[PDB]
Amino acid sequence: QLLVDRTTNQLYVMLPRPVYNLTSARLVLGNASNPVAVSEELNRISKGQSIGIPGAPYATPTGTPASQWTLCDTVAKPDSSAPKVETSILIRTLAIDSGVGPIRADQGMLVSYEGANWLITEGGRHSIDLADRAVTSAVGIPVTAKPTPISQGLFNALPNRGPWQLPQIPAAGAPNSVGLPENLVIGSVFRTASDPQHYVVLPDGVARVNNTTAAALRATNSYGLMQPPAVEASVVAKIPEQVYVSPLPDQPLDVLLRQDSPVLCWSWQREPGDQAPKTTVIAGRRLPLPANAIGTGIDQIGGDSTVYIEGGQFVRLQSPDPRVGESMYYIDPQGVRYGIANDDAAKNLGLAGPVNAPWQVVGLLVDGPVLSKEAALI
């Protein structure tokens, strides 16, 4: 039995005692108890000690589940001695437009993390050794390029999709044993007669190669071979086929500049059915949001993150590590993570149907206490 005080707004739970919060009183009774409007009936009677969790939220008001979970990285000015980064965690439906849209397939950005340069592309990130000057010239990074800083939260979210390093050619500099003209050396490139194709020379044949990789292969070695020589369409068939596993892209990459693109976001959207959440990479002038919501940034007490959440959430997280299972977490409207020990206890708060949220974004939220029946008595 729960009694709401008329003027103090204090809650008393009766079992065989006052309670800090409505969550604490609903957890202990084993049911989502609506409190009676009793004030002289408890103030004139016996009192006790304050039970319940203090760190827990007052109530658990879930709203419509959030469509997108997004990490946003904002760099006010790249041209600085040491630039500052502001992290925004948007747990709401995103607003896309001409100013802030998702990055194109042939588009990327340069970022510096822990004294290393990374190249944030469409689906992830790649380790670029900016000293590999010929490679950066083939990809499209200008000589006047400079990387900017990037958040740890955003860096972990962006999948590492391998470095942009040409694979070493084991018999480099050796003469062509395949029978191709003596000008062609092993570690060289050949062109052929709509769109022409480039081939790289290897010890046991030749392999096809995109323009970015052909450019970089010639610029890193050359071997005195000015311009790629032409080969017929037939002479290449007698020579065997090999596969160069070059990570470089086909079209040269347009490098976004932070002075034009001050916000870099990564976004996760749970999809229906057996689909895999759609992860998009977004860049722009501002945060991907409507103007009306620009003022509601909840600065996190215990974190360098500004939370733009809309209503409470009930979520389930599945980690790929087997030693880590799957966990339910309640997120209040302030954007604070509160773990839930079990299904029975989730039913005592009126929380049903936890939706899937990412570990990438939910891990960055401040972790408050756990909503267990056992943890109330303290």
PDB file of N, CA, C and O in Angstrom, residues 114-142:
ATOM      1  N   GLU A 114      44.783  10.135 -30.769  1.00  0.00           N
ATOM      2  CA  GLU A 114      45.924   9.584 -30.041  1.00  0.00           C
ATOM      3  C   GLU A 114      47.192   9.600 -30.906  1.00  0.00           C
ATOM      4  O   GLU A 114      47.868   8.582 -31.066  1.00  0.00           O
ATOM      5  N   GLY A 115      47.484  10.780 -31.452  1.00  0.00           N
ATOM      6  CA  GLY A 115      48.664  11.032 -32.275  1.00  0.00           C
ATOM      7  C   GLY A 115      48.725  10.272 -33.579  1.00  0.00           C
ATOM      8  O   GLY A 115      49.823   9.990 -34.066  1.00  0.00           O
ATOM      9  N   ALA A 116      47.543   9.918 -34.133  1.00  0.00           N
ATOM     10  CA  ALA A 116      47.404   9.181 -35.391  1.00  0.00           C
ATOM     11  C   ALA A 116      46.336   9.812 -36.240  1.00  0.00           C
ATOM     12  O   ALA A 116      45.362  10.341 -35.705  1.00  0.00           O
ATOM     13  N   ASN A 117      46.512   9.736 -37.561  1.00  0.00           N
ATOM     14  CA  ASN A 117      45.567  10.279 -38.521  1.00  0.00           C
ATOM     15  C   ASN A 117      44.710   9.161 -39.044  1.00  0.00           C
ATOM     16  O   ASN A 117      45.234   8.117 -39.422  1.00  0.00           O
ATOM     17  N   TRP A 118      43.395   9.381 -39.046  1.00  0.00           N
ATOM     18  CA  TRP A 118      42.383   8.459 -39.554  1.00  0.00           C
ATOM     19  C   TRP A 118      41.577   9.164 -40.622  1.00  0.00           C
ATOM     20  O   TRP A 118      41.423  10.385 -40.592  1.00  0.00           O
ATOM     21  N   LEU A 119      41.024   8.391 -41.545  1.00  0.00           N
ATOM     22  CA  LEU A 119      40.233   8.898 -42.662  1.00  0.00           C
ATOM     23  C   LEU A 119      38.779   8.396 -42.548  1.00  0.00           C
ATOM     24  O   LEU A 119      38.468   7.272 -42.928  1.00  0.00           O
ATOM     25  N   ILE A 120      37.900   9.227 -41.985  1.00  0.00           N
ATOM     26  CA  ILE A 120      36.498   8.852 -41.788  1.00  0.00           C
ATOM     27  C   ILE A 120      35.755   8.852 -43.140  1.00  0.00           C
ATOM     28  O   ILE A 120      35.461   9.911 -43.697  1.00  0.00           O
ATOM     29  N   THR A 121      35.420   7.643 -43.629  1.00  0.00           N
ATOM     30  CA  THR A 121      34.697   7.413 -44.885  1.00  0.00           C
ATOM     31  C   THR A 121      33.249   6.949 -44.568  1.00  0.00           C
ATOM     32  O   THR A 121      32.904   6.792 -43.398  1.00  0.00           O
ATOM     33  N   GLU A 122      32.416   6.766 -45.622  1.00  0.00           N
ATOM     34  CA  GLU A 122      30.987   6.359 -45.597  1.00  0.00           C
ATOM     35  C   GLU A 122      30.596   5.305 -44.516  1.00  0.00           C
ATOM     36  O   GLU A 122      29.626   5.507 -43.776  1.00  0.00           O
ATOM     37  N   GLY A 123      31.320   4.193 -44.485  1.00  0.00           N
ATOM     38  CA  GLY A 123      31.044   3.077 -43.584  1.00  0.00           C
ATOM     39  C   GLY A 123      31.916   2.901 -42.358  1.00  0.00           C
ATOM     40  O   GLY A 123      31.605   2.063 -41.512  1.00  0.00           O
ATOM     41  N   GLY A 124      33.000   3.650 -42.251  1.00  0.00           N
ATOM     42  CA  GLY A 124      33.847   3.526 -41.084  1.00  0.00           C
ATOM     43  C   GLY A 124      34.994   4.497 -41.072  1.00  0.00           C
ATOM     44  O   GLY A 124      34.825   5.687 -41.361  1.00  0.00           O
ATOM     45  N   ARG A 125      36.167   3.976 -40.700  1.00  0.00           N
ATOM     46  CA  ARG A 125      37.401   4.732 -40.619  1.00  0.00           C
ATOM     47  C   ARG A 125      38.557   3.863 -41.098  1.00  0.00           C
ATOM     48  O   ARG A 125      38.456   2.637 -41.096  1.00  0.00           O
ATOM     49  N   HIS A 126      39.633   4.511 -41.557  1.00  0.00           N
ATOM     50  CA  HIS A 126      40.821   3.835 -42.072  1.00  0.00           C
ATOM     51  C   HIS A 126      42.095   4.528 -41.597  1.00  0.00           C
ATOM     52  O   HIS A 126      42.161   5.756 -41.626  1.00  0.00           O
ATOM     53  N   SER A 127      43.116   3.758 -41.190  1.00  0.00           N
ATOM     54  CA  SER A 127      44.387   4.341 -40.726  1.00  0.00           C
ATOM     55  C   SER A 127      45.260   4.799 -41.900  1.00  0.00           C
ATOM     56  O   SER A 127      45.805   3.967 -42.629  1.00  0.00           O
ATOM     57  N   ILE A 128      45.386   6.126 -42.077  1.00  0.00           N
ATOM     58  CA  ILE A 128      46.164   6.730 -43.157  1.00  0.00           C
ATOM     59  C   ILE A 128      47.483   7.245 -42.577  1.00  0.00           C
ATOM     60  O   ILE A 128      47.479   7.985 -41.587  1.00  0.00           O
ATOM     61  N   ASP A 129      48.609   6.805 -43.168  1.00  0.00           N
ATOM     62  CA  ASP A 129      49.940   7.257 -42.786  1.00  0.00           C
ATOM     63  C   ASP A 129      50.187   8.449 -43.672  1.00  0.00           C
ATOM     64  O   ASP A 129      50.585   8.294 -44.829  1.00  0.00           O
ATOM     65  N   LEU A 130      49.888   9.650 -43.163  1.00  0.00           N
ATOM     66  CA  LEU A 130      50.046  10.882 -43.944  1.00  0.00           C
ATOM     67  C   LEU A 130      51.483  11.094 -44.509  1.00  0.00           C
ATOM     68  O   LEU A 130      51.626  11.852 -45.467  1.00  0.00           O
ATOM     69  N   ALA A 131      52.518  10.393 -43.973  1.00  0.00           N
ATOM     70  CA  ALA A 131      53.884  10.446 -44.506  1.00  0.00           C
ATOM     71  C   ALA A 131      53.994   9.670 -45.832  1.00  0.00           C
ATOM     72  O   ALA A 131      54.927   9.916 -46.597  1.00  0.00           O
ATOM     73  N   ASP A 132      53.037   8.752 -46.119  1.00  0.00           N
ATOM     74  CA  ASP A 132      52.970   8.001 -47.378  1.00  0.00           C
ATOM     75  C   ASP A 132      52.379   8.969 -48.381  1.00  0.00           C
ATOM     76  O   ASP A 132      51.182   8.944 -48.676  1.00  0.00           O
ATOM     77  N   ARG A 133      53.235   9.929 -48.777  1.00  0.00           N
ATOM     78  CA  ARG A 133      52.874  11.075 -49.599  1.00  0.00           C
ATOM     79  C   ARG A 133      52.303  10.661 -50.925  1.00  0.00           C
ATOM     80  O   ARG A 133      51.303  11.242 -51.320  1.00  0.00           O
ATOM     81  N   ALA A 134      52.904   9.690 -51.624  1.00  0.00           N
ATOM     82  CA  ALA A 134      52.379   9.269 -52.928  1.00  0.00           C
ATOM     83  C   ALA A 134      50.962   8.710 -52.802  1.00  0.00           C
ATOM     84  O   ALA A 134      50.119   8.991 -53.655  1.00  0.00           O
ATOM     85  N   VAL A 135      50.685   7.973 -51.725  1.00  0.00           N
ATOM     86  CA  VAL A 135      49.354   7.402 -51.510  1.00  0.00           C
ATOM     87  C   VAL A 135      48.310   8.495 -51.330  1.00  0.00           C
ATOM     88  O   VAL A 135      47.224   8.413 -51.908  1.00  0.00           O
ATOM     89  N   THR A 136      48.637   9.510 -50.528  1.00  0.00           N
ATOM     90  CA  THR A 136      47.707  10.602 -50.265  1.00  0.00           C
ATOM     91  C   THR A 136      47.471  11.425 -51.537  1.00  0.00           C
ATOM     92  O   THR A 136      46.406  12.025 -51.679  1.00  0.00           O
ATOM     93  N   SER A 137      48.456  11.443 -52.461  1.00  0.00           N
ATOM     94  CA  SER A 137      48.309  12.147 -53.732  1.00  0.00           C
ATOM     95  C   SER A 137      47.377  11.382 -54.682  1.00  0.00           C
ATOM     96  O   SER A 137      46.684  12.019 -55.480  1.00  0.00           O
ATOM     97  N   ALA A 138      47.326  10.040 -54.582  1.00  0.00           N
ATOM     98  CA  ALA A 138      46.492   9.204 -55.448  1.00  0.00           C
ATOM     99  C   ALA A 138      45.024   9.210 -55.039  1.00  0.00           C
ATOM    100  O   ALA A 138      44.143   9.178 -55.895  1.00  0.00           O
ATOM    101  N   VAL A 139      44.783   9.244 -53.731  1.00  0.00           N
ATOM    102  CA  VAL A 139      43.458   9.269 -53.101  1.00  0.00           C
ATOM    103  C   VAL A 139      42.739  10.631 -53.258  1.00  0.00           C
ATOM    104  O   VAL A 139      41.515  10.635 -53.338  1.00  0.00           O
ATOM    105  N   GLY A 140      43.477  11.744 -53.267  1.00  0.00           N
ATOM    106  CA  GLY A 140      42.899  13.082 -53.386  1.00  0.00           C
ATOM    107  C   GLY A 140      43.029  13.965 -52.159  1.00  0.00           C
ATOM    108  O   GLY A 140      42.364  15.000 -52.093  1.00  0.00           O
ATOM    109  N   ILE A 141      43.909  13.623 -51.199  1.00  0.00           N
ATOM    110  CA  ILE A 141      44.113  14.471 -50.031  1.00  0.00           C
ATOM    111  C   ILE A 141      45.016  15.595 -50.471  1.00  0.00           C
ATOM    112  O   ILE A 141      46.122  15.312 -50.930  1.00  0.00           O
ATOM    113  N   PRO A 142      44.620  16.871 -50.331  1.00  0.00           N
ATOM    114  CA  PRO A 142      45.537  17.954 -50.734  1.00  0.00           C
ATOM    115  C   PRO A 142      46.804  18.027 -49.864  1.00  0.00           C
ATOM    116  O   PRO A 142      46.792  17.554 -48.729  1.00  0.00           O
TER     117      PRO A 142
END
